[PDB]
Amino acid sequence: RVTNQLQYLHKVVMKALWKHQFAWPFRQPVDAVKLGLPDYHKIIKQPMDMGTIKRRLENNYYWAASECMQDFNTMFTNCYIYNKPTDDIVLMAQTLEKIFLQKVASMPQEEQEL
């Protein structure tokens, strides 16, 4: 489905996060081979990334904005769970997630199909 909220998530939230200077670790799935992380998929059971979310938004995969919001959350949470407290990527996720929250606070209030 296309809805007002999903349109906003795509054209405002994803637009802003994708081009952010801290977006680059999150633009594609975590590549455990490239990164040398033999435990990544043992710890993180539902990988998510902004490449997947953006493709889902482009292909009308979502029925409601809440589903898309959960994917963003999962991506950020995975990052916090997997990494150490002092890792830079935590600070990068935090910066992106605050923008995510700021924009979500101003999303159209009642979901309706376009």
The contact set with its own copies (CB under 8 A) reads 5, 43-44, 64-66, 69-70, 73, 76-77, 80-82, 85, 90, 94, 97-98, 101-102, 104-111
Does 15 carry a binding-site annotation? no
CB of 25 to ligand EAM, least distance (A): 4
Stretch that binds ligand EAM, among 60-68, 77-85, 95-103, 106-114 (CB under 6 A): 77-85
Q: Which residue has the tokens 């490449």?
A: 51
Residue 79 in the binding site for ligand EAM (CB under 6 A): yes
Instruction: Identify which of residues 35 and 101 has a Cβ nearer to ligand EAM in the complex.
Output: 35
Coil, strand, or helix at residue 3? strand
C-alpha angle with apex 7: 96 to 53, nearest 5 degrees?
50
Contact between residue 79 and residue 89 where contact means Cβ atoms under 8 Å apart: yes
Q: What is the largest CA-CA distance in the chain?
A: 44
16, burial (CB in 10 Å: exposed 0-12, middle 13-18, buried 19+): middle
Positions touching ligand EAM (CB under 6 A) are: 25-26, 30, 35, 37, 79, 82-83, 88-89
